[PDB]
Amino acid sequence: GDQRFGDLVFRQLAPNVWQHTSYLDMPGFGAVASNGLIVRDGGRVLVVDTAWTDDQTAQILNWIKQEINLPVALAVVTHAHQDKMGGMGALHAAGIATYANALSNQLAPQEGLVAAQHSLTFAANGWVEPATAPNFGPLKVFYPGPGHTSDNITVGIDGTDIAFGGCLIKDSKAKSLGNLGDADTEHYAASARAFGAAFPKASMIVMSHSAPDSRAAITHTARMADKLR
């Protein structure tokens, strides 16, 4: 189900949902895939995460023009690392409203990234305060606690069985938790579990660096994270 468009890959996950994938050479780990989402909600399109770069992110927008041909209303990005926010400039230049966790926006500049235009804030129970996520449509945003990074957020898609863990969640056969440079090692396992608990109906777990997996990905990630304490 993998449709190729330039150097990116687009896979349809549900009637109105596609996964976007872009690649970055990291001498040392090969050409590393990073995944986000594209969601059509009526007459507009919503994006979760940029690609690694502005040029790749512009190509996402070109694919949207070709295959969907509706305006992109907004993007939400799930933490301040290059794989998730490297293409913010391309979104802004295209006039697309952007949203991120407030903490992501605070950290973005010192990370060499462009902050989103708008900040999300979260209730005590982890769910986004809805007034900070206007026009999010079926996107349901949850802060599970610090894990892969202190600012990591997660997104469910109402009307589907899909939940997106971003870089918090690794697949059920992953050998490690990947980049732990900015991780909260004490809290990671609990945060991974909290993501699962927030989206109990989700059977397709989408994540940054592997194809979509079952809920076992969540359990496996949390077991690996337990080893960090």
HSE toward the beta carbon, residue 196, CA cutoff 13 A: 18
Residues touching Zn ion: how many (CB under 5 A)? 4
- Residue 45 or 60 having the CB closest to Zn ion: 60
Residue pair 163/156 in contact (Cβ under 8 Å)? The answer is yes
Q: Which two tokens stand for residue 117?
A: 């235009």
Distance CA(57)–CA(36), nearest Å, equals 11
Alpha helices (H) in 68-215, listed in sequence order: 82-85, 88-93, 102-107, 188-198
> Least separation, in Å, of the C-beta of 65 and Zn ion?
27
Interface with Zn ion, residue 107, by CB under 5 A: no
Assess 21 for contact with Zn ion (CB under 5 A): no
Question: From CA 160, how far away is CA 151, in angstroms rounded?
Answer: 25
Residue with the shortest CB distance to Zn ion = 81
Residues in contact with Zn ion, shown as a per-residue x/- string from 53 to 92 under the rule CB under 5 A: ----------------------------x-x---------
- What is the spatial distance between Cα 99 and Cα 18, in angstroms, rounded to a whole number? 20
In the numeric block, the tokens 């993007």 are attached to 75
> Of 162, 164, 148, which is closest to residue 77 (Cα–Cα)?
164
CA 88, 89, 92, 96 torsion: positive or negative?
negative
Q: Is 171 annotated as a binding residue?
A: no
**Smallest gap, in angstroms, from Cβ of residue 174 to Zn ion?**
12
Work out which of 74, 153, 167, 206 binds Zn ion, going by CB under 5 A. Answer: 167
Residue 118 annotated as part of some ligand binding site: no
Residue closer to Zn ion, measured from CB, 30 or 130: 30
Encoding tokens for residue 212?
Answer: 């979509």
User: How many angstroms separate the CA atoms of 15 and 50, rounded?
Assistant: 21
Shortest CB 79 distance to Zn ion, Å: 5
Nearer to Zn ion, 81 or 193 (CB): 81
Instruction: Give 115's DSSP letter.
Output: P
* 140 belongs to the binding site for Zn ion (CB under 5 A): no
Residue 148, marked binder = yes
Binding residue for Zn ion, selected from 208, 212, 220, 224, defined by CB under 5 A: 208
- Minimum distance from CB of 10 to Zn ion (Å)? 19
Binding of Zn ion at residue 40 (CB under 5 A)? no
Question: Residue numbers of the site for Zn ion (CB under 5 A)?
Answer: 81, 83, 167, 208
Residue list for the binding site for Zn(2+) = 79, 81, 83, 148, 167, 209
Residue list for the binding site = 79, 81, 83, 148, 167, 209
